[PDB]
Ligand binder design. Structure first.
Ligand SMILES: O=C(CCC(F)(F)F)N1CCC2(CC1)CC(c1ccccc1)=NO2
Ligand SMILES: O=C(CCC(F)(F)F)N1CCC2(CC1)CC(c1ccccc1)=NO2
Lengths: 191, 191
């Protein structure tokens, strides 16, 4: 009931901000797109940023599900290959124009640096730790504490995507950044 | 005269916000600390955040000077060694409680994402590109476009420092993150 109003607001905001950016669409337009009144919207979300926070949750969940799907489909036969495929999967999902606009461009502004990292952490860490733990167990990555490596890799990957997202030639940035990420990955991976 | 008032406000704000955080010290207390009136302060800085921006400039300049000093003192004889020493120097300068409070914690909040990145870029990028260009010229790092590598390393290094700054056991986080960065560096450096 209130749940339905929330879902419709989230879906509408996600679509519209996905196309034009956070800064460019006001809450009244989103309400109308969702078919709810300003009163019903304000009951669910005190302000714009509160709606954005729930939009980021749904988008990041879908980012993580899409990553798992691409890693499972990549045909990686070793943990090392799976790490390589995960890097490609992120460059692929981060290039989706909605993910680019909402996560790479709008979320660092609206949530701050700490808020963005918090979101990135909660969604990304588990899978990152997992892939690391598996390469280690297979002897393909030197034995280490998992959390610090995970954190650095996440920071490097999030920054890679941002650099592609704002570059004048996205196509060249993506290719050159992929090479960079490859070398950095291949420098810690054994074989 | 008013120049002196500017310097004393910057020095006082830097010290006090360094110790207690931006949010915890008001402009009246900083005026008093510097021995100047509210009207002299307001003549130099329209508001609190304007003062903070100048504080960030002097602190980031000192971050960069202290990094150059640590790299020059390491006795690095090759570009590779200089990259190794620069990584250590950043973890060391990052861990200064004033740098931690003003740059890592307060600046993202007060400046906003775009403003903070802009500042971090202007102070970091030049030196990062330089050390990369030198390792390449020496044959110690594979020939590649400089900007993408620079940006990924910056993202990894900024995230390393953030993780140390907010970790439960900062001392263990620093040591383990340093090891991680060393492996990652040693994997790409030919020498
Ligand atoms: O969802 C995010 C970031 C979301 C954001 F909100 F911060 F933007 N990802 C980046 C990190 C991951 C997941 C996707 C993990 C990963 C990986 C690759 C190789 C070895 C270990 C982990 N690649 O991408
Ligand atoms: O000032 C900042 C960051 C400011 C922040 F606002 F983002 F926090 N620095 C981080 C990156 C640098 C310089 C200092 C670059 C560097 C290095 C080391 C090895 C090879 C290449 C570059 N070490 O630290």
């Amino acid at each position: 009931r209130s749940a339905a109003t929330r879902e419709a607001l989230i879906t509408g905001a996600r679509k519209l901000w996905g196309l034009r950016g956070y800064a460019e669409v006001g809450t009244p337009e989103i309400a109308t797109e969702a078919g709810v009144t300003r009163g019903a919207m304000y009951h669910q979300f005190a302000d714009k940023a509160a709606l954005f926070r729930d939009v980021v949750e749904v988008v990041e969940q879908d980012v993580m599900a899409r990553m798992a799907t691409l890693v499972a489909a990549s045909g990686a036969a070793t943990p090392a290959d799976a790490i390589r495929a995960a890097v490609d999967a992120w460059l692929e999902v981060s290039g989706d124009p909605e993910v680019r606009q909402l996560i790479l461009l709008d979320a660092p502004v609206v949530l701050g640096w700490a808020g963005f990292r918090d979101v990135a952490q909660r969604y990304s860490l588990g899978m990152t730790e997992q892939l690391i733990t598996e390469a280690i167990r297979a002897g393909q990555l030197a034995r280490q504490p998992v959390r610090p490596l995970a954190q650095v890799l996440i920071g490097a990957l999030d920054e890679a995507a941002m650099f592609i997202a704002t570059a004048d030639d996205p196509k060249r940035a993506r290719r050159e950044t992929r090479q960079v990420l490859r070398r950095l990955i291949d420098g810690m991976l054994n074989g």
